Amino acid sequence: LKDLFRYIWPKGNNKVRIRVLIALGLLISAKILNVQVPFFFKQTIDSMNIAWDDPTVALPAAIGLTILCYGVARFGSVLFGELRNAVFAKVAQNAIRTVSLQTFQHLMKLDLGWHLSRQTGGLTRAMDRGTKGISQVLTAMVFHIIPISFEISVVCGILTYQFGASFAAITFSTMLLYSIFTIKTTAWRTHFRRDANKADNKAASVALDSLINFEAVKYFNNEKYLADKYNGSLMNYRDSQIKVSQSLAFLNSGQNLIFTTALTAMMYMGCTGVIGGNLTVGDLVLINQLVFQLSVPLNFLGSVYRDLKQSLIDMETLFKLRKNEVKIKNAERPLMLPENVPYDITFENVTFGYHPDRKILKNASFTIPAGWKTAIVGSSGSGKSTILKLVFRFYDPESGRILINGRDIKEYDIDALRKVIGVVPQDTPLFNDTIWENVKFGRIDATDEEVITVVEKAQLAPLIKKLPQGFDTIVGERGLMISGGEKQRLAIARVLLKNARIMFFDEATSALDTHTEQALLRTIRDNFTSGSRTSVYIAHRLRTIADADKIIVLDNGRVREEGKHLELLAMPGSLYRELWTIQED
Amino acid sequence: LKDLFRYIWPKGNNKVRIRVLIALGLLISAKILNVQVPFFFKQTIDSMNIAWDDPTVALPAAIGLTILCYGVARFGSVLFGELRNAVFAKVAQNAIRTVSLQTFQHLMKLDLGWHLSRQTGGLTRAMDRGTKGISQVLTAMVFHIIPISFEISVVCGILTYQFGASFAAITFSTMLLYSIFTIKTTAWRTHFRRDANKADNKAASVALDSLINFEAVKYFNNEKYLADKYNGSLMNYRDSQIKVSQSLAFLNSGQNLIFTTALTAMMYMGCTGVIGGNLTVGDLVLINQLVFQLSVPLNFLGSVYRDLKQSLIDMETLFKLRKNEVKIKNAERPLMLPENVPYDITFENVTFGYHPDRKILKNASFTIPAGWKTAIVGSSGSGKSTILKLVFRFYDPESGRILINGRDIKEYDIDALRKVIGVVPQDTPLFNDTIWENVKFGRIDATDEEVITVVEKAQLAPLIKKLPQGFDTIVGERGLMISGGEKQRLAIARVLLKNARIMFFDEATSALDTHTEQALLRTIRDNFTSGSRTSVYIAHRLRTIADADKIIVLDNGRVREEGKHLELLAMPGSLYRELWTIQED
Numbered sequence A, B: 001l002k003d004l005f006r007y008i009w010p011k012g013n014n015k016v017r018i019r020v021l022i023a024l025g026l027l028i029s030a031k032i033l034n035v036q037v038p039f040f041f042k043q044t045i046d047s048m049n050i051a052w053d054d055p056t057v058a059l060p061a062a063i064g065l066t067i068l069c070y071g072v073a074r075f076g077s078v079l080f081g082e083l084r085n086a087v088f089a090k091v092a093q094n095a096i097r098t099v100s101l102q103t104f105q106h107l108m109k110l111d112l113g114w115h116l117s118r119q120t121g122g123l124t125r126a127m128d129r130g131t132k133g134i135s136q137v138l139t140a141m142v143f144h145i146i147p148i149s150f151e152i153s154v155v156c157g158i159l160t161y162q163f164g165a166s167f168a169a170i171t172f173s174t175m176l177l178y179s180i181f182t183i184k185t186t187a188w189r190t191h192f193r194r195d196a197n198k199a200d201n202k203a204a205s206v207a208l209d210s211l212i213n214f215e216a217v218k219y220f221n222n223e224k225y226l227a228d229k230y231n232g233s234l235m236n237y238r239d240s241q242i243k244v245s246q247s248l249a250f251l252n253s254g255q256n257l258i259f260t261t262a263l264t265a266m267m268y269m270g271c272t273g274v275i276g277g278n279l280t281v282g283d284l285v286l287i288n289q290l291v292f293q294l295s296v297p298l299n300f301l302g303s304v305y306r307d308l309k310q311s312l313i314d315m316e317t318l319f320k321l322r323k324n325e326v327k328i329k330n331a332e333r334p335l336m337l338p339e340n341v342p343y344d345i346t347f348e349n350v351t352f353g354y355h356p357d358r359k360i361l362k363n364a365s366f367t368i369p370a371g372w373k374t375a376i377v378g379s380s381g382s383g384k385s386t387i388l389k390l391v392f393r394f395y396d397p398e399s400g401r402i403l404i405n406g407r408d409i410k411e412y413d414i415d416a417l418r419k420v421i422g423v424v425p426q427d428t429p430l431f432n433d434t435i436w437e438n439v440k441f442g443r444i445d446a447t448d449e450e451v452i453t454v455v456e457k458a459q460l461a462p463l464i465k466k467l468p469q470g471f472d473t474i475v476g477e478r479g480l481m482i483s484g485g486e487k488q489r490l491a492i493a494r495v496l497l498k499n500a501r502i503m504f505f506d507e508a509t510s511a512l513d514t515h516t517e518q519a520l521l522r523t524i525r526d527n528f529t530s531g532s533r534t535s536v537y538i539a540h541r542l543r544t545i546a547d548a549d550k551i552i553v554l555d556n557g558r559v560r561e562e563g564k565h566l567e568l569l570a571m572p573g574s575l576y577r578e579l580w581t582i583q584e585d
């Protein structure tokens, strides 16, 4: 409940502070009128209690005027309440916008290991629940918590100042018992609430992880297994929610029992005071109406805001997302890459592990030169795409250096380094919109003719002619509404559009036939000058990297061989020779 | 609001019907006591209005008893309210469990084209919002809509039967104006509500489609573009929510103005009646308290249930999910596949298109024989995986037949057909749990030794030894926390575990090196007898399908060539010959 106060009452921006102060003033005045209306009611009561000696007499003007004042005060209370609602809505919605956008920006700033460890549906669910929790927390703390507190305070003061100290003792002992009971009961309901939250999260995790792999669910006939798992989670959530609802019923019943005992004790004290010729029926009316219109709001907002602590939990998960750690960040004095030169990557005694318990790279050292086409090869699980994610600075090594033109990539603006490097990754999840905006995701600021020409160079024009909604065909969930080769070609088109200098191709020809593959590689190596771009091909089809100027063979996270094609093929004891042997026959 | 009544009041299961009837009875009695308490208040008032001639007199017993009855009726009202809450909670949670499970089952029953066209995050968001909407709709329709309606009815009746017909006219004209105003105002707020819903859905779609492709977002430096898109959606949602909150404030203010005019008119009528020696101050107290304790609940539940129509929209989207169409369903008299025989697929003049405007297969006809290893090849976008999804009966063709052992696959139980067919798909999205339960997803009812031996046959033992948490390593979001070859090998292991008869391999060696590839194919073709399984390899590395007994070459959705390796290679004019030529040099 602190960060929220930092968003609704921030440093600077006196506009929102003035808005909050006006909301507070309207709240105050609303409660003042809601507490003053019963005095007008008492006045009209005690003024009508006289003996009228003529049934035809017209209503005196004083009583008409005080009834008018009663109605006007009731209306004014509700009116100020609603104006407060409006103003603080204008405030809370700005707060929610701000926090949602900041959280999105951060999520975009975080590292990869933090996103892969977590399920995206979980992040979106947390964000939605947290925005709704902010909304409910505010809608409750400025409509039905602070106002009822102010009203309780002024009611205690009135009943202590106008009807003696007895009523004061009654009210204070009542507040004491109310607090004790609510405390000892929330300490016992929190358990069921926690269980229900856990079970709901588990059930949603199951549903999501199942719908994502719907194919891999039907392919193996495990619908019933997952449905029974979901049903178990749901049956735990059901029992927990039932128990918390029963406990909340018990809570509210006991609260209202305490309050009603207080109310009847107040009626009895006022009645034995009227007996003593001190008070009057007007006083009983006043006391009972004060306490009753203070009570029924309390009971109803307590039984209605049955979900407010869960809202705090959601909001806190959201703020935790917003306050995680950014492992990859610019230095204090970040440089910027050269202007017009070919780039040269260099791994110097690097050693990296996605987790501290395993080392994927064991003292790797090599040189990806400038203007040349190098090709990385090796066994699977050997640390090829790991290099590709180090240079792009998704992770940073634990020991060693990554140099570009002789400067560690930590001395560079990450956003300036990630703008000269263009990657065709292994997995190519696209968007759920047209082919147009997915090919135009490389250079948003691109003229459509460039999109068209790179599409023609990525061997995509035939597909675009066959499809009847060419350049508008929706490609469904992460690209599943098209082929696997077409996704590779869309990614290659994105990369040709970025028009970068260092081009990584992590198996961009694994789903393409030999014809399309060779045509595409020819179109690529013939698009750029012979000394401009620095290309790195992660290849398992060693026939596509035969024209490479430097082949980097690595195994078990260590560079074993380095050299051109024939220098390795015509050399005994070479792993590349064994791979080419098994590839030839 | 009809399907909900079908879940809370179903055919059979008299238990839930009796529970609902008891909840209704408790609601009735609660409102009865809440309407009777003011009569006790009036009695004590009019009994204390006498002139006491001794300040020391003790309180008579009748007045003490009627005050006791007043407090007891207040407590009983709240108590019955809370018991009703508990009971109907036990009912509504069962309803929610039932609907969630049925919706999940259906989603699992629907076809693929329905899942690919939609984003899974959207489905999970709809389900969550719909469950919360069911909860809120019930919590509002049995706590603060039906009860207030019954109370309004009995209040109208009382004020019509006990204080003449004037009060009746006042109350009925008040209800008329209230209704007219609320109608003409909701007709004007629905627009802002719709706009806000649209914008929230758009913003969430953006956030999701961006977090899923976080890699493809950072790889191209389009964080700011997506953040500005999100901010635009959020700034539309902000203005719309602001406008609906202001409009709701105006609504509630006008409602309470009408109600307060009614209240003051009632006070004036009662006062001019007291003038006429007919009524008494007790009557004014009674009227005003009835109307006031009927009012403040109404106003507060109206300003609190600001989100109830959106809940209906969510619940209706959920029920629509639950009432979509199942294109793929068993026949009326479904057969079951033979017991112990090799299966033989046969496409007979088939013609299929994922959408009615394009035909991926143009009169395809061929025969995947039994006990043999056939291999499908052809250009990309040519309709290979389409076959693989037809046989598995994800879609059904528009013209033609798919035969297994001479019987159309429509005359078979889909769940019996999908249990003899094991697929290694192109895209292999795994789960977010250990390698163990992802290799044990083929045959859940498998002894761990089989898991271990298939893992050893899928060339995964080395990885399992290297990892320090072997067989427990979490594989992150859809398998991104491991290699791309390791995912292929996990899928091949799943398939070897299913121990099926018809094995489809849609490019299961695209990320594996030649060494692992040949070792794995050898381990596979040597695991089963030479005439048991029927294998279909979708291959782009034509060196892995040279030992095939039948190669099916298709282009532009039509089978062009069919025959063994050399029969096509040593034949001029063959597409397979051109592919092998481009693959050799």
Ligand SMILES: CCCCCCCC/C=C/CCCCCCCC(=O)O[C@H](COC(=O)CCCCCCCCCCC)COP(=O)(O)OCCN
Pocket: A028, A032, A035, A036, A039, A146, A149, A150, A153, A154, A157, A158, A161, A162
């Ligand atoms: C989390 C937030 C917590 C904050 C807590 C702060 C609140 C502290 C409590 C305040 C004590 C107020 C006690 C009021 C004493 C006055 C009682 C009284 O008789 O006043 C009434 C009604 O006035 C009325 O209508 C009285 C209404 C109250 C008057 C001022 C309220 C205080 C405003 C403070 C602004 C922040 C006047 O009617 P009469 O019968 O003519 O009284 C004759 C006596 N002069």
Ligand SMILES: CCCCCCCC/C=C/CCCCCCCC(=O)O[C@H](COC(=O)CCCCCCCCCCC)COP(=O)(O)OCCN
Pocket: B028, B032, B035, B036, B039, B146, B149, B150, B153, B154, B157, B158, B161, B162
């Ligand atoms: C979406 C749902 C819509 C459903 C609508 C149905 C409701 C229809 C409305 C009902 C009209 C009720 C009219 C009540 C007339 C009785 C008024 C009255 O004077 O009764 C009071 C209080 O009783 C009381 O406490 C009166 C309380 C009401 C008595 C019965 C209520 C009806 C129960 C129906 C059950 C379904 C008795 O106090 P006294 O001063 O002693 O009265 C002396 C006269 N005998």
Ligand SMILES: Nc1ncnc2c1ncn2[C@@H]1O[C@H](COP(=O)(O)OP(=O)(O)NP(=O)(O)O)[C@@H](O)[C@H]1O
Pocket: A480, A481, A482, A483, A484, A485, A486, A511, A512, B113, B116, B354, B355, B360, B379, B380, B381, B382, B383, B384, B385, B386, B387, B426
């Ligand atoms: N839901 C879909 N809606 C429309 N078209 C689709 C859909 N799914 C696949 N396609 C298209 O239908 C054509 C053939 O699809 P597909 O059967 O996957 O080819 P493929 O043989 O798998 N190519 P590849 O896997 O790369 O070797 C292509 O034009 C696809 O883009």
Ligand SMILES: Nc1ncnc2c1ncn2[C@@H]1O[C@H](COP(=O)(O)OP(=O)(O)NP(=O)(O)O)[C@@H](O)[C@H]1O
Pocket: A113, A116, A354, A355, A360, A379, A380, A381, A382, A383, A384, A385, A386, A387, A426, B480, B481, B482, B483, B484, B485, B486, B511, B512
């Ligand atoms: N988030 C991760 N956490 C732990 N291990 C990982 C993670 N990501 C990748 N790995 C592991 O690190 C090792 C090398 O990963 P990787 O760099 O992707 O190999 P690769 O060269 O891409 N193989 P392939 O793409 O199939 O040719 C493998 O054992 C992976 O399983």
Ligand SMILES: [Mg+2]
Pocket: A384, A385, A426, A506, B483, B484
């Ligand atoms: Mg890789």
Ligand SMILES: [Mg+2]
Pocket: A483, A484, B384, B385, B426, B506
């Ligand atoms: Mg395919």
